[PDB]
Amino acid sequence: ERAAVLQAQRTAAAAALENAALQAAELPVDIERRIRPIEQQVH
Amino acid sequence: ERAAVLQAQRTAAAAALENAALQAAELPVDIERRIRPIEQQVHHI
Amino acid sequence: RRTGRSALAVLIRACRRIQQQLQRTRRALFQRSNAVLTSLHHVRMLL
Amino acid sequence: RRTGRSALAVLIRACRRIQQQLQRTRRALFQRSNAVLTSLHHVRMLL
Amino acid sequence: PPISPEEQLTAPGGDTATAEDVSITQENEEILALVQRRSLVEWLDRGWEALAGGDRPDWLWSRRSISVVLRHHYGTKQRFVVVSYENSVAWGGRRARPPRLSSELATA
């Protein structure tokens, strides 16, 4: 009875990777628009 | 015996979840060190 | 005076509004990743 | 000369360093944010 | 070039309120400026009404706003799709009756 639950929670945590990895798909994205068009203003 | 397999797969990735969490909590440290010297220049010039 | 100083009111406001957004880019970029800090710890909270 | 240009470098050296002060915030945000997903690549090797 | 529908899942872009993204651009393109100093959708209907010969309300929301979001399944590691049109009374539609969802229990 545990082994189904201990698998199904593990399959959830395997799915919660790409639930969070696709949610962490903005961490190299949210920085370019807040830096790059501001420096040529300084120019 | 599957309880011996799945708990080892849970807890070893659970440190890797914390090796991700100790890498992801390093991310809000960043700009809190970056622009704190760039916020110096505001009212002066 | 309206040529020498008025070439500078162009260029005093120019630097003093670049520096003001940099206060707001600190604040609007980790309150999206604090939800990432919530979910990434929540994966082991499932476990 | 010194009545019109001696205060220019206050606005000039300010406007020639935010090019450098914000490009150092580029790579230090791309040397430190890529390591999170690479550690998340490690979890898929275990799960 | 072809239209790849899978790139709409894998290009990292989504929704934003954008009111914070107007003031972050109005104080960005004024620096710039201080230093310096019938639509196309109505012609899409005749694009369908001549090539098909009819209205087809199935195809009517293929002209309007379509979001195609990828998610995943907690049971068997699988993927699936979350869809919302513009004119849908369903969730994510831009013609929808309040009350709507609140992501509060998922944060509390």
From Swiss-Prot, chain A:
Function text: Capsid vertex-specific component that plays a role during viral DNA encapsidation, assuring correct genome cleavage and presumably stabilizing capsids that contain full-length viral genomes. Participates in the interaction between the capsid and the tegument through interaction with the large tegument protein/LTP.
Cell compartment(s), UniProt: Virion; Host nucleus
The encoding gene: CVC2
Entry protein name: Capsid vertex component 2
Protein family: Belongs to the herpesviridae CVC2 protein family.
Shown residues in whole-protein numbering: 50 to 92 of 585
SUBUNIT field: Heterodimerizes with CVC1. Interacts with major capsid protein/MCP and triplex capsid protein 1/TRX1 at the pentamer vertices. Interacts with the large tegument protein/LTP.
Protein's organism: Human herpesvirus 2 (strain HG52) (HHV-2)
Curated annotation (Swiss-Prot), chains C, D:
Entry's localization field: Virion tegument; Host cytoplasm; Host nucleus
UniProt superkingdom: Viruses
Post-translational modification: Proteolytically processed, possibly into several polypeptides. Enzymatic activity is only detectable following cleavage of the UL36 protein, which occurs late during viral replication.
Cysteine disulfide links: none
Subunit structure: Interacts with host CUL1 and CUL4A; these interactions inhibit the E3 ligase activity of cullins. Interacts with inner tegument protein. Interacts with capsid vertex specific component CVC2. Interacts with the major capsid protein/MCP.
Family of the protein in this entry: Belongs to the herpesviridae large tegument protein family.
Biological function: Large tegument protein that plays multiple roles in the viral cycle. During viral entry, remains associated with the capsid while most of the tegument is detached and participates in the capsid transport toward the host nucleus. Plays a role in the routing of the capsid at the nuclear pore complex and subsequent uncoating. Within the host nucleus, acts as a deneddylase and promotes the degradation of nuclear CRLs (cullin-RING ubiquitin ligases) and thereby stabilizes nuclear CRL substrates, while cytoplasmic CRLs remain unaffected.
Protein name: Large tegument protein deneddylase
Natural source organism: Human herpesvirus 2 (strain HG52)
Location of this fragment in the whole protein: 3075 to 3121 of 3122
From Swiss-Prot, chain E:
Superkingdom classification of source: Viruses
Localization terms from the record: Virion; Host nucleus
Subunit structure, as described in the record: Interacts (via C-terminus) with capsid vertex component 2/CVC2.
Similarity comment: Belongs to the herpesviridae CVC1 protein family.
Protein task: Capsid vertex-specific component that plays a role during viral DNA encapsidation, assuring correct genome cleavage and presumably stabilizing capsids that contain full-length viral genomes.
Name this polypeptide is given: Capsid vertex component 1
The organism of origin for this protein: Human herpesvirus 2 (strain HG52) (HHV-2)
Residues of the whole record sequence present: 227 to 422 of 702
